[PDB]
Structures are given as structure tokens and as C-alpha cells.
């Protein structure tokens, strides 16, 4: 499950643009 990781960290990004509208 190293993807899990990479998925994670990378919805981060969504989850900050979400947050930032």
C-alpha cells in the first residue's frame, strides 16, 4: 500500500484548495 501514501498526501492538496474555497 505505498500508493495510499502518495493518493494521501496528494488529496492533501484538494483538501487545502477546498479549504481555501
Known amino acids: 500500500e505505498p500508493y495510499n501514501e502518495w493518493t494521501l498526501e496528494l488529496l492533501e492538496e484538494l483538501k ?6
Open 16 to 21: 487545502s484548495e477546498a479549504v481555501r474555497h
